């Protein structure tokens, strides 16, 4: 009953916001990541890294503000405040993109803290740790997209900037440059996200429309007691309904709920892997057989060839402004263009 156990007691007390040992890592880092994002989107520019306004102070709105990535010339610098780029000068640190690494790194450590919190509370309360396990999917996506991806590329510059439209720009980049929609790891992610949303809506709807009449009122919500042992809806009527509408139906509530965990978590892990490949430009860009035929046969056209012309429009039209450090100058006569437009 020495000091470590006394502190344990206090961290683990039942209060409005549970703290735990995990809170020591989580609460500073989450607060700082959030704080950094609100600070930069309110007050901080991207003039010197991107040639962009990016704060409310500058004229931007909620959709176009962003904490933008550092300049390509920073490489993968940690851009510490006390480091050799900013040399303790908070102002220069801001203008150099310091808040991007600040947010990404504290965010990373916050996510570790959050997942440790799911472990810590689960242990104290006596549950199994499947929510912590399910949260690995968010972590894998964050690390693969925000950290692994730019680490394979030339710089943090090509990571996603923290902003609504900046991320929209990230999506469009990955189409024109990586042809990411043609990637089977993205496609399984899509199936996971949409499969999860479907499961979510279809499971809630089913439960709500196979309710037992447990009260006289027309609001059926009241007719639930959280301590009742009885199932509040008929699994048997639900199973007959779906067997006859769709052919197959769940029969096991445990498998049902485990499937709901499995699908969106698997989908996100899959897409994380594809992004790892794209860190290296290891893209699912082309089908070799299509290009051989199309090169030899000017009448061969597929939706595949049509989208690559779209990708080529995007690259030539967006790269000068989106990669200012490359000093691309494309005269009018080199821009790829269809007729009239």
């Amino acid at each position: 009953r020495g000091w470590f156990d006394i502190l344990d007691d206090w961290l683990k007390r039942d209060r409005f916001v549970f703290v735990g040992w995990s809170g020591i890592l989580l609460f500073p880092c989450a607060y700082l990541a959030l704080g950094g994002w609100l600070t930069g989107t309110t007050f901080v520019t991207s003039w010197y890294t991107h040639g962009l306004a990016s704060s409310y102070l500058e004229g931007c709105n909620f959709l176009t503000v962003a904490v933008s990535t550092p300049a390509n010339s920073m490489g993968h610098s940690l851009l510490l405040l006390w480091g050799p780029e900013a040399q303790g000068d908070f102002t220069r640190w801001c203008q150099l993109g310091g808040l991007w690494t600040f947010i990404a790194l504290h965010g990373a450590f916050g996510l570790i803290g959050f997942m440790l919190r799911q472990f810590e509370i689960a242990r104290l309360v006596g549950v199994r740790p499947y929510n912590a396990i399910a949260f690995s999917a968010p972590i894998a996506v964050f690390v693969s997209v925000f950290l692994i991806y730019p680490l394979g590329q030339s710089s943090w510059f090509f990571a996603p900037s923290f902003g609504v439209a900046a991320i929209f720009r990230f999506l469009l980049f990955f189409q024109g440059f990586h042809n990411w929609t043609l990637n089977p790891f993205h496609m399984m992610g899509v199936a996971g996200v949409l499969g999860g949303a479907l499961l979510c809506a279809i499971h809630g709807a089913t439960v709500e429309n196979t309710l037992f009449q447990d009260g006289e009122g027309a609001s059926t919500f009241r007719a639930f007691n959280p301590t009742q042992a009885e199932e509040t809806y008929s699994m048997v009527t639900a199973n007959r309904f779906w067997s006859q509408i769709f052919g197959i139906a769940f029969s096991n509530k445990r498998w049902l709920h485990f499937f709901m965990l499995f699908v969106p978590v698997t989908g996100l892990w899959m897409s994380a892997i594809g992004v790892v490949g794209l860190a290296l430009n290891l893209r699912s860009y082309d089908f070799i057989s299509q290009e051989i035929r199309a090169a030899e046969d000017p009448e061969f056209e597929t939706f595949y060839t049509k989208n690559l012309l779209l990708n080529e429009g995007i690259r030539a039209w967006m790269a000068p402004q989106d990669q200012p450090h490359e000093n691309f100058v494309f005269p009018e006569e080199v821009l790829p263009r269809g007729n009239a437009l």
Partner: protein, 334 residues
């Protein structure tokens, strides 16, 4: 015991392995017609002049496509929104060239899917259930109406409806982004929120229930065998689950009422998808996403670019390249 009453009793029978019902009287044929034409077209249809410029697009496996690139190609721009059944062609050869199968498939499928939603009401009624599962399915169905019918109506042509193909789906969404800046449209933003959130809440609910299953099995058997079909007792401990989740956030951010929780599970994705269906359906009438192009300028009047301007650069590259031989005039007004 009357012949018609016998048929009526077979139609609505709750003892059929798949329920038929009156909606199904329409659904079975129209889905069979759509499915059969689609399978045959995906495999063997010849190239279709989707944009009406005598530039046929190959979509089928036998003409050099794989699973990812294949499509049933939309019907020709030359047809517009005109009805092009088989019997309006001089020959099947002509109907194939101009994209007739696409029209056949999408009209049967939309009918059959609409009857699918009705069939869901119908069996709910015969089984003594509550009625609103079909309301959840109206979210996906409205979304299919948007990209197959409403958007073609507003733009004037089924040639701009979504292809029945994996890569054609992508073409559609790229060209939609350049003509409508859908990413900057708040209804698409809400659909992303319905779909990300639905997946999130799917995972949450499945992990919280799975976290609080009551010990009923040994280490050497799946815990699934701890639930038996039609048992009356709950198989998990929602008070344990509420106690974890409310401490993970705080108490009043966690459900302790299963009925509210499952209703929330139903409501969130259904409504975000309604909006995103509505997003496609209103961009059908060219009420496009927010435009912040050159919205920031400096004291002199120089443009100061934002990330919206960068988006615009990408959008331009999509605009100038798409349907590259189909425009003769400077504005792509539809």
């Amino acid at each position: 015991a009357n012949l018609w009453e016998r048929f009526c009793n077979w139609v609505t029978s709750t003892d059929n392995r798949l329920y038929v019902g009156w909606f199904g009287v329409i659904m079975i044929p129209t889905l069979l017609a759509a499915t059969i034409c689609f399978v045959i077209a995906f495999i063997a249809a010849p190239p279709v002049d989707i944009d009406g410029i005598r530039e046929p697009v190959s979509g089928s496996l036998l003409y050099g496509n794989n699973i990812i690139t294949g499509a049933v190609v939309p019907s020709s721009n030359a047809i517009g929104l005109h009805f092009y059944p088989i019997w309006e062609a001089a020959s099947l050869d002509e109907w194939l060239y101009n994209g007739g199968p696409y029209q056949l498939i999408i009209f049967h499928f939309l009918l059959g899917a609409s009857c699918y939603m009705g069939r869901q009401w119908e069996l709910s009624y015969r089984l003594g259930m509550r009625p609103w599962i079909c309301v959840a399915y109206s979210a996906p169905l409205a979304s299919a109406f948007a990209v197959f019918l409403i958007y073609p109506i507003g733009q004037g042509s089924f040639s701009d409806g979504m292809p029945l193909g994996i890569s054609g789906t992508f073409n559609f969404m790229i060209v939609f982004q350049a003509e409508h800046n859908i990413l900057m449209h708040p209804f698409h933003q809400l659909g992303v929120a319905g779909v990300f959130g639905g997946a999130l809440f799917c995972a949450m609910h499945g992990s919280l229930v799975t976290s609080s299953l009551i010990r009923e099995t040994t280490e050497t058997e799946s815990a699934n065998y701890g639930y038996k079909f039609g048992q009356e007792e709950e198989t998990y401990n929602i008070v344990a689950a509420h106690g974890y989740f409310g401490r993970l956030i705080f108490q009043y951010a966690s459900f302790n009422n299963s009925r509210s929780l499952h209703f929330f599970l139903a409501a969130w994705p259904v409504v975000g998808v309604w909006f995103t269906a509505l997003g496609i359906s209103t961009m059908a009438f060219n009420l496009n996403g927010f435009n912040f192009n050159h919205s920031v300028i400096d004291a002199k009047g120089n443009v100061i670019n934002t990330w919206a301007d960068i988006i615009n650069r990408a959008n331009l590259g999509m605009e100038v390249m798409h349907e590259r031989n189909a425009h003769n005039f400077p504005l792509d007004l539809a």
